Symmetry: C3
Subunit: 134 residues, 3 copies
């Protein structure tokens, strides 16, 4: 499916770096580091990296998952400190990336570097029914 997704550009430099689907078959949008200067990430360290963007999914039938990038993660050990992020339909603040160096090699994160992937999935809100036995 498609969905109209409201996007606020919090940092004007990101007008030139908006997330884009690579192909019509792509599942994810790439989120980039909105940084004034490169950030060095030592092995084991975590940085909170702004994206310069906010979204409003709005429809409670959907959420977004934020995932590491395959190359950064596999090749450089640059992943997410919370592993996978969950963006609620009513979350309207800046998207921030918990960036964790899970490997053994110091890495320099560049301004505007693609850092994570955003995937929009349907979700269900359960209504619990307490039972003694299933």
């Amino acid at each position: 499916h498609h969905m109209k997704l409201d996007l606020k550009i919090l940092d004007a430099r990101m007008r030139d770096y908006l997330p884009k689907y690579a192909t019509t078959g792509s599942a994810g949008l790439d989120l980039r580091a909105c940084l004034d200067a490169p950030v060095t990430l030592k092995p084991g360290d975590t940085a909170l990296v702004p994206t310069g963007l906010a979204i409003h999914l709005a429809d409670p039938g959907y959420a977004a998952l934020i995932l590491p990038r395959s190359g950064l993660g596999h090749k450089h050990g640059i992943v997410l400190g919370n592993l996978v992020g969950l963006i609620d339909s009513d979350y309207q603040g800046e998207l921030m990336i918990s960036t964790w160096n899970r490997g053994q090699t110091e890495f320099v994160l560049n301004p505007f570097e693609r850092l994570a992937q955003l995937v929009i999935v349907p979700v269900v809100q359960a209504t619990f029914n307490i039972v003694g036995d299933f």
Copy 2:
């Protein structure tokens, strides 16, 4: 969407700590540690933490993902040892959280502390079709 979700309270202390959606726009349910006493997690260690709860999704068109919490993960390095848990529609045992300290700071997990997020997503069962070329 909404779904009727059968829930068994395996440990009576959890009647006062049932998972709840924070808002009508929330995607996830918070799962809590069902513990008699605090558990200290040294850097690198993994503990299997009970929730005191079991669910039965029942509908094979759905599954649950269990994710780290953003604050615990980012700020304290308390995440999941299997990274992301997948709960099958027919899994009816106690939900257990593989809790891993991925950081460098010893952490004390409290009884009833929110430890993970549960998100219900639709899933598809594929029927493979072996081909020589796509």
Copy 3:
């Protein structure tokens, strides 16, 4: 739901080891290591492990998530170096598993060992709408 999923067997040894849903209620398919010989993974190391298989989801309304296995991850610290893999509907290359030993114990990965889980989920492609305020 169900979906016809084209599958190319890139390595003939995998004809005897095709992924299979354990039960009609299972959400995930197990992906196995297609290896000539066991691979030793020291703590902290990452290996790129072939599956001997390629899929073509084809429908841009779906994607696959590749997750660690719960037992391997929890008990042995054998997880994914990119944490969670995202397979796009138009990705038709060999499925490769970034295999990372996140724990403190050396592990030997066996030929044909189940290494990851593949889950097919619906996804949405957003059309951004830039707004000044939500």
